[PDB]
């Protein structure tokens, strides 16, 4: 599968730096214009930088001077160096293959994207979450997971490590007055297959090394 896998978001004080990367699968990063597009929380897309095959870059106004796109062929990986970071830079960052070459002719669109890597430019210190069970109605019955008081966004949550996919709702987090975010993840489940199953939610909040599992018994 031709694919881009991104690594290393995080939280940083303004003026700080940060490095993002993408590791390519089934294609050589050296053979393409490689490109970075970011998305601010609630906003649309914004192109930030391109890496040409010849190593020279091109940068967007908001970012020229502070950012560098580089690649490492030996690791078939793409990099973006993010210097003198400011709040305006707080966004989800997408690496993407630009299936193009203006040395030749043809352009084939930006056809492969990384899953998006989140960057929080802030002065607050990382606050990690707490994971509370949400135990149980019809012919089916619901249960979930409350994850509360964390900074910054985001959080990773799954049901039994990928297993339970269907009838799941992980909700947008809400910003509490306290300053911290809180989010709830819940899964619709047949009351028939009652608590005789092991329902574990899997919460992960990268900005602090916090990874939790949790049964949700009544």
């Amino acid at each position: 599968e031709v694919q881009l896998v991104g690594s290393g978001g995080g939280l940083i004080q303004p003026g700080g730096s940060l490095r993002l990367s993408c590791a390519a699968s089934d294609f050589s990063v050296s053979e393409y214009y490689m490109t970075w597009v970011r998305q601010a929380p609630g906003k649309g897309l914004e192109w930030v930088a391109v890496l040409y095959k010849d190593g020279s870059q091109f940068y967007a106004p908001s970012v020229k001077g502070r950012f560098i796109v580089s690649r490492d062929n030996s690791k078939n990986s793409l990099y973006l160096q993010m210097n003198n970071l400011r709040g305006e830079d707080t966004a989800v960052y997408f690496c993407a293959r630009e299936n193009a070459d203006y040395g030749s002719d043809y352009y084939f669109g930006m056809d492969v994207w990384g899953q998006g890597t989140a960057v929080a430019v802030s002065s607050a210190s990382t606050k990690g979450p707490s994971v509370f069970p949400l135990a149980p109605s019809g012919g089916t019955a619901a249960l979930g997971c409350l994850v509360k008081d964390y900074f910054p966004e985001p959080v990773t949550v799954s049901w039994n490590s990928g297993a339970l996919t269907s009838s799941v709702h992980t909700f947008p987090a809400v910003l509490q007055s306290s300053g911290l975010y809180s989010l709830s993840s819940v899964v619709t489940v047949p009351s028939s297959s009652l608590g005789t199953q092991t329902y574990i939610c899997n919460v992960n909040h990268k900005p602090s090394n916090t990874k939790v599992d949790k049964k949700a018994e009544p």
Binding site: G44, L45, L134
Partner: protein, 215 residues
């Protein structure tokens, strides 16, 4: 320095009725190439953008037949021949010629038949209490349309200001929404009362239903 302008900002469509989205450019996207440098990307909820159309009218690998891309010069249109539930998301145009500028995005929504919400309620945890706070949660697991009124009543007396609500993005299969209200108070104030009720109004109900629980 090209500006993309893209309308409508949003779009509600009946499944299997067509949909148009327009991209007009501050200047021409044609070329020596005899080609139009405009692409269409669609971003489903939680996903990265995905390529749909490029060079104005070339559908891309593994993109359904019902998407087409048309237009020329300064004016282009992404056309869905018949919309399906999967198509729900934000659509963006982009020109790469100079210098990768996006449209503002037509969000697309699906006109589904009305559907009352299954309503659930969840009491504070053992451990959240064993730590001195109490969040009460109220699930509206699947419903349509979005507009849903979650009234929190403590001891059958109204509540107003101490609880926030979050709303899922339209489902990709059933075109549903879902909402998670959270009543938050100290314990302390929590253990001041007994009756704790979620009351829900919606287009698709006869009477506002009330699932609940007492201390």
């Amino acid at each position: 320095d090209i500006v993309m302008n893209q309308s409508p900002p949003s779009l509600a469509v009946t499944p299997g009725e067509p949909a148009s989205i327009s991209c007009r450019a501050s200047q021409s996207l044609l070329y020596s190439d005899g080609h139009n440098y405009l692409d269409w990307y669609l971003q489903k909820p939680g996903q990265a953008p995905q390529l749909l159309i490029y060079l104005g009218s070339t559908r891309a690998s593994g993109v359904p037949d019902r998407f087409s891309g048309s237009g020329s010069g300064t004016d282009f249109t992404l056309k869905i021949s018949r919309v399906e539930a999967e198509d729900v998301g934000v659509y963006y145009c982009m020109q790469p010629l100079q210098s990768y500028t996006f449209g503002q995005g037509t969000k697309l929504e699906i006109k589904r038949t009305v559907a009352a919400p299954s309503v659930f309620i969840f009491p504070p945890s053992d451990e959240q209490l064993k730590s001195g706070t109490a969040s009460v949660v109220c699930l509206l697991n699947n419903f349509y349309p979005r507009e849903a009124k979650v009234q929190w009543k403590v001891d059958n007396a109204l509540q107003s200001g101490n609880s926030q609500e979050s709303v899922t993005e339209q489902d990709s299969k059933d075109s549903t929404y879902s909402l998670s209200s959270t009543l938050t108070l100290s314990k302390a104030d929590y253990e001041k009362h007994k009756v704790y009720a979620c009351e829900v109004t919606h287009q698709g109900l006869s009477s506002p239903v009330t699932k609940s629980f007492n201390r």
